[PDB]
Short mmCIF file of C-alpha atoms in Angstrom, two decimals:
data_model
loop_
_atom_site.label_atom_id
_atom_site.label_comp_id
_atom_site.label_asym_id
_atom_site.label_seq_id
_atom_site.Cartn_x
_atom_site.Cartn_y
_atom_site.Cartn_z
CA UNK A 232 -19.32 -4.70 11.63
CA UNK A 233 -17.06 -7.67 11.28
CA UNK A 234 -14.32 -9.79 12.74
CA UNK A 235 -10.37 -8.24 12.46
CA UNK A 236 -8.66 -10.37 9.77
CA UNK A 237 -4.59 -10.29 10.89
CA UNK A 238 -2.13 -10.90 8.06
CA UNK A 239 -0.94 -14.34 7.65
CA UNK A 240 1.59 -14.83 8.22
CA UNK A 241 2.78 -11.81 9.88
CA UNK A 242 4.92 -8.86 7.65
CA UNK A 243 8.12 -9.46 7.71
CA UNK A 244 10.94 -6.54 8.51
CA UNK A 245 14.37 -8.48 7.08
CA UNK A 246 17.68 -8.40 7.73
CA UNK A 247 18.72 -5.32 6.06
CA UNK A 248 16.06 -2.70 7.31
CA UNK A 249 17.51 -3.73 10.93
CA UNK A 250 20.27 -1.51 10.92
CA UNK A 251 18.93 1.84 10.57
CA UNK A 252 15.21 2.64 12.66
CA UNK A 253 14.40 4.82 10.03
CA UNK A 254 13.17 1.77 8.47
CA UNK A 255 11.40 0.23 11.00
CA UNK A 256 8.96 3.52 11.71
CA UNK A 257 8.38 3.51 7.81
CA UNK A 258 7.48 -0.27 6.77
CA UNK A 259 4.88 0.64 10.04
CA UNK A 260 4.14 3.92 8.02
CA UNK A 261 3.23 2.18 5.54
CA UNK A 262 2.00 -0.85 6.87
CA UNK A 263 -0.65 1.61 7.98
CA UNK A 264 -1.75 3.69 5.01
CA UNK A 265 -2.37 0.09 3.34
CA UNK A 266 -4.41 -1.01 5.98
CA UNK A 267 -5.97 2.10 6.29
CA UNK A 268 -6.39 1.72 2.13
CA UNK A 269 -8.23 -1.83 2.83
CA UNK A 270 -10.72 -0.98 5.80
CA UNK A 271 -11.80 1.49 3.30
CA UNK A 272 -12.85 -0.37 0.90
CA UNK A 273 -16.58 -2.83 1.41
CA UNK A 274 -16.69 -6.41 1.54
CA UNK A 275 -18.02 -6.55 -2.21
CA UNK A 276 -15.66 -3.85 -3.43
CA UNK A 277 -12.50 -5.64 -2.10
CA UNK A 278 -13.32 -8.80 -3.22
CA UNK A 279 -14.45 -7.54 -6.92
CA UNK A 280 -10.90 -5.45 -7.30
CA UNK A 281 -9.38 -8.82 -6.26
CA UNK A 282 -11.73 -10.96 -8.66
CA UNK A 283 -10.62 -8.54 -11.54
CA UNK A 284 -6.54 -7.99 -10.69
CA UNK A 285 -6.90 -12.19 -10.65
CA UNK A 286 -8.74 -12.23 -14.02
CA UNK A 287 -7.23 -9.46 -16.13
CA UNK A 288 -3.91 -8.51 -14.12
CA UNK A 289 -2.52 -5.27 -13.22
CA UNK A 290 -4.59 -1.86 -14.62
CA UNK A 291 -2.19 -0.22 -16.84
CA UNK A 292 -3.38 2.78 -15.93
CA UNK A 293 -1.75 2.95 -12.15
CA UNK A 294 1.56 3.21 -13.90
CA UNK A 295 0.82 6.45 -15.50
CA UNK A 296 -1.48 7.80 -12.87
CA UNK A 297 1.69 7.29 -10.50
CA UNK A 298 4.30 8.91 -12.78
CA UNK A 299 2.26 11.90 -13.33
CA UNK A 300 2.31 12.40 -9.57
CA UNK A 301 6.31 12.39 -9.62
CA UNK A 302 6.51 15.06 -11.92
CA UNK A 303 3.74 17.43 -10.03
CA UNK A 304 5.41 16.21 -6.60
CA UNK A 305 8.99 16.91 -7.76
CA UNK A 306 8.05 20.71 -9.43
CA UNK A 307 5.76 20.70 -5.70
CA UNK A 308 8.76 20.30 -3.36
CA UNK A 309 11.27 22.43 -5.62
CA UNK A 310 8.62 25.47 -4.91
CA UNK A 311 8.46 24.34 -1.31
CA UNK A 312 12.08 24.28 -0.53
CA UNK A 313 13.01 27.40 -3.08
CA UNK A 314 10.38 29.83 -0.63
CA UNK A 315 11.05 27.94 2.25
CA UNK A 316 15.20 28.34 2.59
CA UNK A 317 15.19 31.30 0.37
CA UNK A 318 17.69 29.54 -2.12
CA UNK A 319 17.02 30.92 -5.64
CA UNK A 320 19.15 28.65 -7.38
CA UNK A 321 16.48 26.34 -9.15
CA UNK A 322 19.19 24.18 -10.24
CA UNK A 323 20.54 23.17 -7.35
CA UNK A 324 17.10 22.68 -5.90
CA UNK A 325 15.99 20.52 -8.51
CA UNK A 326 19.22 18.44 -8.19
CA UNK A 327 18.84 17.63 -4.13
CA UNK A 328 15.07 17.25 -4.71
CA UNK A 329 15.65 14.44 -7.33
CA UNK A 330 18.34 12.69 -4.87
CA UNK A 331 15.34 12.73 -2.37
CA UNK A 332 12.88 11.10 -5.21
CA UNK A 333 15.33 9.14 -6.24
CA UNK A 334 14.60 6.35 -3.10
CA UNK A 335 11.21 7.49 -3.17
CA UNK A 336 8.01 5.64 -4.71
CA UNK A 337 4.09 6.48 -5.54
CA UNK A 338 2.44 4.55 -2.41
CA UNK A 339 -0.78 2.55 -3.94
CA UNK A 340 -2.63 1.92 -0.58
CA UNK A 341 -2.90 -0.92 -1.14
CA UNK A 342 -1.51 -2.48 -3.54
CA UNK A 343 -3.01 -3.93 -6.70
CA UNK A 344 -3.15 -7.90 -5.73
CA UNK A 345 -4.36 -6.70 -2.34
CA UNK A 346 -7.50 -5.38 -3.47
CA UNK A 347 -6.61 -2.07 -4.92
CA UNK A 348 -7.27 -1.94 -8.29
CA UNK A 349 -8.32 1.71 -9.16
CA UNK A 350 -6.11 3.61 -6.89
CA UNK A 351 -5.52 7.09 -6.08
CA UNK A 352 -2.56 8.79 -5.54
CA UNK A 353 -1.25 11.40 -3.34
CA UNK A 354 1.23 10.80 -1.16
CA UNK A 355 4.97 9.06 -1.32
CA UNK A 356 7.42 6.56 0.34
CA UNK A 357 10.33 4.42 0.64
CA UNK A 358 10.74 2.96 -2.58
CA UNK A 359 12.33 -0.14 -1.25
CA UNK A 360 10.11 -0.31 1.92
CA UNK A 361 7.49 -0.08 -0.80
CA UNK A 362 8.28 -3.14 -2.68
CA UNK A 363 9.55 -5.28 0.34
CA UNK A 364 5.51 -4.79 1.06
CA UNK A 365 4.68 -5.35 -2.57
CA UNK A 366 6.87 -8.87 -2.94
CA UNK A 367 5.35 -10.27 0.63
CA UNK A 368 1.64 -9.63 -0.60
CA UNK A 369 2.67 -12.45 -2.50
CA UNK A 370 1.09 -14.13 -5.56
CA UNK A 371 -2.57 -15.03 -6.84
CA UNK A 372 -2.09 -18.59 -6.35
CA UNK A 373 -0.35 -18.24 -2.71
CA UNK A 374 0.55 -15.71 0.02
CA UNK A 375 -0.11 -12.65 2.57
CA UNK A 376 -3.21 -11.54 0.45
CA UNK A 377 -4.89 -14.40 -0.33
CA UNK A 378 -4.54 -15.68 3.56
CA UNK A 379 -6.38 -12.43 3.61
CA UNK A 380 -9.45 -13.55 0.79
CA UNK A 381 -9.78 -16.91 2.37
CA UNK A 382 -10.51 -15.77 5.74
CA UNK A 383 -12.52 -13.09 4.91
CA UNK A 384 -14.90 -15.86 2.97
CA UNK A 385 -15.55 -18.04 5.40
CA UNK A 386 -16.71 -14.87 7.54
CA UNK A 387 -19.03 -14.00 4.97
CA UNK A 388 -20.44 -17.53 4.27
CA UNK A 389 -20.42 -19.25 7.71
CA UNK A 390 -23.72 -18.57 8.85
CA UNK A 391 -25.70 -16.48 8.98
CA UNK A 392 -24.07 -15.94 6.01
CA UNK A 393 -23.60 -12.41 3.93
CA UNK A 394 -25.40 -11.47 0.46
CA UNK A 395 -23.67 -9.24 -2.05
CA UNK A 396 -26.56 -6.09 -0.77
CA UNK A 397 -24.90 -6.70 3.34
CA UNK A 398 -21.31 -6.96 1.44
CA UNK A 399 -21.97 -3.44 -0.58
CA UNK A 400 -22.29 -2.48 3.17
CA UNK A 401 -19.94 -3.47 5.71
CA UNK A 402 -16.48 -2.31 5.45
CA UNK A 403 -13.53 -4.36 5.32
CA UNK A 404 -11.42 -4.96 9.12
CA UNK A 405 -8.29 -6.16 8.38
CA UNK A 406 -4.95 -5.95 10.69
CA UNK A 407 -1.44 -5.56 9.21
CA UNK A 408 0.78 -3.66 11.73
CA UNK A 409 0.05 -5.52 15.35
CA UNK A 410 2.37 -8.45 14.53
CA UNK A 411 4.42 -7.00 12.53
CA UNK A 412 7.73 -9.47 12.75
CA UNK A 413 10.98 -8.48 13.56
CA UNK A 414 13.33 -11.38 11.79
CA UNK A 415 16.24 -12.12 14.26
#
């Protein structure tokens, strides 16, 4: 196993998700599932899907991979909520569930600078909690996720240090949610 790496500095929850708490149980929500998405992941694979988002950029194919989800989720929920409530008018339907996906996003856990290059994806979220997340990653050159890659090198090369076969092995132990700062 390996030492928990916390986020640095700590996720931020700003001045405009303070109002309603539906906001602060999501950016936890999903806080979580990209967490969850990293201590997934092994040392080697995390740090190769960051070594290739840092040389080539973002995988085109996410995009479509995400927007193919929308349109199976959106016919998914219209079939849900026309058996569910009984309501046969498919028009109306499809009108309140596009309102609902219309503040809703494809979650990447986790996103593409923070190590998750090839993602799959099956579940969805706060489109704006989404991309608060996505902008305090930060960049390649400074932020959240390369605090993250720094740390997580001197673990592995302080010693006695970690080759690439012990990276393809031990899992990735990273901590996003405990400190997760309330701006006042």
């Amino acid at each position: 196993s390996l030492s928990v790496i916390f986020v640095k500095p700590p996720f931020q929850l700003k001045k405009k998700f303070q109002k309603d708490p539906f906001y602060e149980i999501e950016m936890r929500k999903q806080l979580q599932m990209q967490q969850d998405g990293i201590n997934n992941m092994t040392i080697f694979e995390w740090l190769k899907n960051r070594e290739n988002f840092k040389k080539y950029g973002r995988n085109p194919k996410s995009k479509k991979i995400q927007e193919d989800f929308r349109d199976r989720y959106r016919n998914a929920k219209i079939d849900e909520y026309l058996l569910l409530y009984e309501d046969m008018d498919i028009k109306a339907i499809e009108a309140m569930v596009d309102s609902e996906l219309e503040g809703l996003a494809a979650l990447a856990n986790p996103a593409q600078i923070a190590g998750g290059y090839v993602d799959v994806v099956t579940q969805m979220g706060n489109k704006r909690i989404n991309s608060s997340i996505g902008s305090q990653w930060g960049s390649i050159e400074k932020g959240r996720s390369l605090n993250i890659e720094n740390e997580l090198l001197k673990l592995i090369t302080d010693p006695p240090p970690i080759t690439e076969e012990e990276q393809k092995k031990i899992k990735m132990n990273v901590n996003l949610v405990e400190n997760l700062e309330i701006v006042k």
